[PDB]
Design an enzyme around this catalytic site. Structure first.
Site, PDB file in Angstrom:
ATOM      1  CE  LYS A  37       6.288   0.758   7.073  1.00 14.45           C
ATOM      2  NZ  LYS A  37       5.407  -0.116   6.670  1.00 14.45           N
ATOM      3  CB  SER A  87       2.526   6.608  -1.055  1.00 18.59           C
ATOM      4  OG  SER A  87       1.872   6.376  -0.083  1.00 18.59           O
TER       5      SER A  87
END
Lengths: 265, 260
Positions: free
Chosen positions: A44, A236
Site C-alpha cells: 500500500k 496472503s
C-alpha cells in the site's frame, strides 16, 4: 555515497527471492516479490507515494501545500512519507470510531486528524475534505478511487521492477486480488510487455486464470515456506504461494513464475 | 538478474538513511543504519550467519553436517538461514522453560528442539550439546561466546558496509552495546570518535534515560516518518548530543537496531 535521502526513498525496490527448495518440475522457476519490505509493511505504501507524486506532476497541488484525505484509504504510510518529502501538510478526515489504530498511526506520523460524524461514514469524511479544500490554498483531496483502488501506482513501479529484475524472462504472473491486492495494474503492465504472460489472480475463500484458495491451504504453505525457505510470511503470501504451486505443477520447461508475497508473518 | 538466491542473502546490506529534518549545526550530517531490516528484524542475524560460515571456513563442519546449539543465543534467524543455505541440520539444546517463543520460532524454521533440565540452565544446555557432537559425525557446537557475544561478525560485515556506503567519510560512530563495528572503524581511521550508548539500568559514553529515548522515538516518527524502537531512540538521543557540539565537516553514523 550509497545513502537513502529520506525514508520515502525506501518505498519500492523490494526484494525478489527465488524459491529453490520446493521440488519443482524441470526448467520451472519461481520468484517471490516481498512487498512486506515496504516501510509500512505492505504494498500500500506504493499507492500513497504515487497519490502525492501524481497530484504534483498534474499540478493539483504544489510543495508546501496541504493534502486532505477522506480516510487513510489504502495508502499505507506512503502518503505520509511522500508528504514529508515534499513539505506537504497532511490532514485526514475520518468518522470518529473508524479505524482507531490508523488514527494513532497517522498522528504519530504528524498528520492532523479531524473527526467526521460516525454515522455519516465514508460519505461524511469526503464531505469534510471537500470543504477544507474550499478553505485552503494549495490544497488537494483525492477521490476514494485515488485513495483506495488506483492500479496506476503498481503499473508504474511494481510491474517495471519485476520486468527489470528478471530481464523480461517471465511466463506466469500470480497475485492476490482486491483493492489490497496487487494484480491491479501490475498484470496490465506485464501484458503490455508480453501478451503471452499468463496472469493468474488469487482469491481467498472470503485475468487468464483464477484460483480460489482455502485458509487451510494458505496456512499449510505459510508453514512450509518457513521450514524450507526460512520465509516468515502471512496467509496472503501462503495463498499466493499455493496458487503458484498449482501453476508450477503443469508448467513445461522454460517457464518462469512470478508471484507477490504481500504480507509478513 | 537482480534476484536473491535465498533468504540468507537478505542478511545485511541494510539501508542507511540520512537524517535531514533535525535542525543540525552547519556542515554536520547524521546517518542511521537500519539493522531492523534484517530478515529476523535485528542485527543478530549477522552473528548467526557468521557463526555458520566461520565454522565452515575453519572446517569444523561441512555441508550436510549438523549444528548443535546450546541455546539460540544471539543468532536471530541468521543461523537458521545460513544452515538452510548449506544443507546443515540445526539442533537447539534448550532448558525446558527457557525462551518458549524462541523454541516455537526455531521449530517453525525447521530446527530440532531438545529440552535440558530447567535447573541446569545454560550449563545443562551446553552439557547436552557436547554429548551430541560426540555422537554425530560432521557435527559442531559453538561456544557460548561464539553463540552470544562474538564481535567478529560485525567487524566483517556491518563495519565495512558503513565505511563503503559513506566513502570513508565518517567522524563519529554512535551505537548501543558497538563491539566489532567500532574496532573496524578505528582500524580504518583512528580519528573516528567511537561513542557507546548505555540505557538506564570507546572514546565516549552516554547513558540515556527511557524517557529521552521515548521522546526521540516520537520525533523520529513525526519528522522523518521513521518508526523505530527505544534502542534506536536512545542511539538517536546520544547522536544529537554529539551533533550539537560538532564542528562543520563532521559526519555522524549511528545504528538503529529495533523497529517500533
Amino acid at each position: 555515497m550509497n545513502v537513502y535521502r529520506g525514508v520515502h526513498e525506501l518505498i519500492g525496490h523490494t526484494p525478489i527471492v527465488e524459491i529453490t527448495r520446493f521440488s519443482l518440475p524441470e526448467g520451472v522457476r519461481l520468484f517471490a516479490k516481498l512487498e512486506f519490505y515496504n516501510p509500512g509493511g505492505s504494498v500500500k505504501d506504493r499507492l500513497g507515494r504515487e497519490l502525492i507524486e501524481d497530484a504534483l506532476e498534474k499540478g493539483l497541488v504544489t510543495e508546501g501545500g496541504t493534502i486532505i484525505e477522506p480516510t487513510a484509504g489504502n495508502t499505507g504510510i506512503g502518503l505520509a512519507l511522500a508528504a514529508l518529502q515534499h513539505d506537504l501538510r497532511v490532514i485526514v478526515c475520518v468518522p470518529e470510531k473508524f479505524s482507531i489504530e490508523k488514527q494513532e498511526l497517522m498522528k504519530a506520523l504528524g498528520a492532523t486528524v479531524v473527526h467526521t460524524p460516525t454515522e455519516q461514514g465514508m460519505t461524511g469524511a469526503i464531505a469534510k475534505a471537500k470543504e477544507l479544500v474550499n478553505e485552503i490554498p494549495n490544497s488537494y483531496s483525492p477521490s476514494q478511487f485515488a485513495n483506495e483502488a488506483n492500479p496506476r501506482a503498481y503499473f508504474k513501479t511494481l510491474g517495471p521492477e519485476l520486468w527489470s529484475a528478471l530481464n523480461g524472462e517471465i511466463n506466469i504472473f500470480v497475485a492476490g486480488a482486491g483493492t489490497g491486492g496487487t494484480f491491479m495494474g501490475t498484470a496490465s503492465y506485464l501484458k503490455e510487455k508480453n501478451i503471452d504472460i499468463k496472469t493468474v489472480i488469487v482469491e481467498p475463500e472470503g485475468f487468464d486464470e483464477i484460483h480460489t484458495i482455502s485458509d487451510r491451504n494458505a496456512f499449510l504453505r505459510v508453514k512450509e515456506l518457513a521450514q524450507k525457505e526460512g520465509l516468515l510470511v502471512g496467509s496472503s503470501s501462503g495463498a499466493a504461494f499455493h496458487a503458484s504451486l498449482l501453476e508450477a505443477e503443469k508448467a513445461a520447461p522454460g517457464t518462469n513464475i512470478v508471484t507477490i508475497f504481500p504480507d509478513s508473518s
